[PDB]
Amino acid sequence: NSVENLFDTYKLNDTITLKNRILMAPLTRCMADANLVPTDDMVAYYARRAEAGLIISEATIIRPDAQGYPNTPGIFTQAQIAGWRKVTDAVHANGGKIFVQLWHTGRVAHPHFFGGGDVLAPSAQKIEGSVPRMRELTYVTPKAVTVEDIQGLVRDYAKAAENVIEAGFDGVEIHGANGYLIDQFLHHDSNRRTDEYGGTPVNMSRFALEVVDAIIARIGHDRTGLRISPGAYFNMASDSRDRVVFDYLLPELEKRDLAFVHIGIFDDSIEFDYLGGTASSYVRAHYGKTLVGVGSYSAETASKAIAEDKFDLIAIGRPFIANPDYVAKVRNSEELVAYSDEMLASLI
Ligand SMILES: Cc1cc2nc3c(=O)[nH]c(=O)nc-3n(C[C@H](O)[C@H](O)[C@H](O)COP(=O)(O)O)c2cc1C
Ligand SMILES: [C]O[C@]1([C]OC2=[C][C]=C([O])[C]=[C]2)=[C][C]=C([O])[C]=[C]1
Ligand SMILES: COc1ccc(O)cc1
Ligand SMILES: COc1ccc(O)cc1
Ligand SMILES: COc1ccc(O)cc1
Ligand SMILES: COc1ccc(O)cc1
Incomplete structure (x- = not known):
């Protein structure tokens, strides 16, 4: 088997080209200092994952009343x-x-x-x-x-x-x-x-x-992406009427010619009734621009999905915590360590 397509150059737009299709998914770590300033340990943490085509940082609050978790x-x-x-x-x-x-x-x-x-x-x-x-x-x-x-x-x-x-x-x-x-x-x-x-x-x-x-008015459409969850089930009760909201939202988003839309889910193998299938397939059916898939993908299954035109870029979360050298290991077909929640205690 082979995941060569994960190492394709990917032109997001005229401003940004990615050296490969692999994103580091956003991962809250709660390791900032008490003033919510990134630490030099966080500098090293991100720096060692720079082989990713693109890093998405941990969720970063815009003002004080946005805070819901420590540090x-x-x-x-x-x-x-x-x-x-x-x-x-x-x-x-x-x-x-x-x-x-x-x-x-x-x-x-x-x-x-x-x-x-x-x-x-x-x-x-x-x-x-x-x-x-x-x-x-x-x-x-x-x-x-x-x-x-x-x-x-x-x-x-x-x-x-x-x-x-x-x-x-x-x-x-x-x-x-x-x-x-x-x-x-x-x-x-x-x-x-x-x-x-x-x-x-x-x-x-x-x-x-x-x-x-x-x-967009501040940084431009080429530098703006959006993560969405058409489904529910993370501090959100489901509602059969939610899907039509996204039916409207997605074409409106396409008008903005964003850098990407990114799905936010934990396991994209799950099929949701309200969406008529998987989250990624729902979005792909209603949105025709660059799409980042995510959620329990291996390099192998992500490569297949991209080959099958299911989405364009793959975000990797938990395996990037377990394997700082994820990209090099995938490139060299080396063994990857499985993620465990215990790993969150360490910022490596
Ligand atoms: C510890 C942890 C922290 C996360 N923090 C964020 C976050 O800050 N923002 C976000 O949009 N998703 C967050 N996620 C979701 C991930 O970005 C990703 O969608 C999820 O882990 C599924 O991808 P994976 O199977 O490759 O890990 C978090 C997930 C975990 C496990
Ligand atoms: C916050 O985080 C947490 C963090 O996480 C997350 C975030 C965001 C999103 O989107 C997702 C996820 C972690 C851990 C826990 O437990 C909770 C929460
Ligand atoms: C990722 O570590 C944490 C996540 C959430 C939280 O409330 C405390 C720690
Ligand atoms: C926009 O909200 C804030 C901005 C700056 C600041 O020091 C405190 C709050
Ligand atoms: C993140 O937004 C920008 C970054 C760099 C730049 O030259 C213009 C905008
Ligand atoms: C594996 O780490 C986590 C996964 C899911 C979650 O809601 C909280 C932590």
């Missing part, structure tokens, strides 16, 4: 910008490329992290449970954002994108997936609004598109 880096202070610049300089020095993933957690934020302020979301719909690996941080009922809150959020996504330029990233992946703020507007469980941001596919898509457009 997740931000990109809203000068110190954070300076810390990220060390990361991107090191990646670039190693011949790599890197996008930051811009995050707001919405109803999954927790006030413990930002001085007891309001948790924000499309609607006052609380999720079950408490923050993982933390003592007694029970999720709270969010405040339904006002249109003025929304305008500020769009502004702050845009400002974060401006900061990304100063931090030396090649671009931004907007975190529109996995039950976080943008995804909360796209799903009925979390979005029960009756104004121009709720109800209809056009309205539910409005926030996502405003953020995409605001960020």
Whole structure:
């Protein structure tokens, strides 16, 4: 067998060409310093994965009330910008490329992290449970954002994108997936609004598109990607009506000629009734531009999928934690170590 196609050069667009089809998926590590500034250990961590065609950074918060987990880096202070610049300089020095993933957690934020302020979301719909690996941080009922809150959020996504330029990233992946703020507007469980941001596919898509457009206005379409989750099941109850939101959203996104759309799922072998099959096949059926697949792929199954025109680029997550040298090992058909959650305790 052979995975030669994973090492094809891939021209994303006129601004960026990737040296291979392999992305490092965004992976939250919770290892930033207490001021949410990237550490020199994080610099080394990313630098040693620069053989990836493109690194997507761990989710990076746009402002304080976006924080939902400990020590997740931000990109809203000068110190954070300076810390990220060390990361991107090191990646670039190693011949790599890197996008930051811009995050707001919405109803999954927790006030413990930002001085007891309001948790924000499309609607006052609380999720079950408490923050993982933390003592007694029970999720709270969010405040339904006002249109003025929304305008500020769009502004702050845009400002974060401006900061990304100063931090030396090649671009931004907007975190529109996995039950976080943008995804909360796209799903009925979390979005029960009756104004121009709720109800209809056009309205539910409005926030996502405003953020995409605001960020494009800062860094350009060639440097802007978006991660999406048409499905549910990560802090999100399913709803049979969610699919038509994405039916509308995807062609609208295609108008923006993004660097890529990226699916956010853990196992793309799962078929979802509401999507008529796998997440990637649903998106591929409704979106005709560069698509990043992900979720329990091996190099072999990803190569096959790309050969079969199922998607164009492969993001690799857990195996990139277990194998910093993932790309070289795949290139040389060497044995890969299996991932285990225990590995998260170490930043290597
Ligand atoms: C520890 C861990 C952290 C993750 N953090 C992020 C994240 O910050 N942003 C995101 O969009 N996805 C995140 N994911 C999802 C991964 O990007 C990826 O979609 C998932 O791990 C499936 O790919 P894989 O089977 O190759 O690991 C995380 C996954 C894991 C296991
Ligand atoms: C946050 O993270 C966590 C982190 O993770 C994630 C993120 C984001 C996304 O999208 C996905 C995932 C980790 C771990 C745990 O447990 C939880 C959460
Ligand atoms: C990746 O490590 C962590 C993830 C989530 C969290 O709440 C604490 C640690
Ligand atoms: C946009 O929100 C913030 C920006 C900068 C800062 O120091 C604190 C918050
Ligand atoms: C990340 O956005 C940008 C990065 C570099 C640049 O020259 C212009 C925009
Ligand atoms: C394997 O690591 C994880 C996978 C899934 C998840 O929800 C949390 C951690």
